[PDB]
């Protein structure tokens, strides 16, 4: 029986730019494309995952609909509140937000509120893993690595009222002892910025994602996102 694909997608900044911005080749996508992908994954039939759904599909070999795709926004920013989920909302998408929780704590404007987070969570969004205070885990010792996904899960959890199992590494950087630490923390999936679709054969702690780039038609996207 082939091994499943999932095609796990990075976003990262959705907004309409700065004065400042547009003067630099930057990686925002404008919301209006953001929206034009969204409604060509839709027309296509596609199915939106939740975490919980690609742990089970990559795990018992098998996926909920023909076409299916995890949508994942990094660094828990507040474009993903004022734009972003809107968006997903008008197409009934569900997508998953990898949280710094450091930065919710801290109660910085730049970032998702737990507030905000809870009222998300009952229309499909889902919040994960992405560390306190987003080191370069590689850098980092095994005790700090630990203390770094460990305390950021346990505030999840709490807060949220739930069991996160997705984590995201900051940059996409690990090596051996920051998957073996997720393994032990109970983490069940783990996304990287390795450029590809996603499978098992990756690694459940070190997926593939396909990075979202700001030229990306809704055309070129959805080829990019067949197996
Ligand atoms: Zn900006
Ligand atoms: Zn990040
Ligand atoms: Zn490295
Ligand atoms: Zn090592």
Sequence with gaps: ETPVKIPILMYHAIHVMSPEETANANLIVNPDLFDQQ????????????????????????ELPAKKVVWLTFDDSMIDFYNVAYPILKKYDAKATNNVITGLTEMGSAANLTLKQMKEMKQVGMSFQDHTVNHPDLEQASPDVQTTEMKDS?????????????????????????????????????????????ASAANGLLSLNRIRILPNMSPENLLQTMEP
């Design 38 to 61: 969204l409604q060509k994954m839709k027309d296509e039939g596609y199915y939106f995952l939740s975490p919980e759904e690609v742990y089970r599909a990559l795990s018992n070999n």
């Design 153 to 197: 899960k346990d505030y999840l959890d709490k807060q949220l009222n739930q069991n996160t199992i997705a984590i995201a590494y900051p940059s996409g950087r690990y090596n051996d002892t920051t998957l073996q630490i997720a393994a032990r923390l109970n983490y069940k999936l783990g996304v990287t910025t390795n450029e590809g679709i």
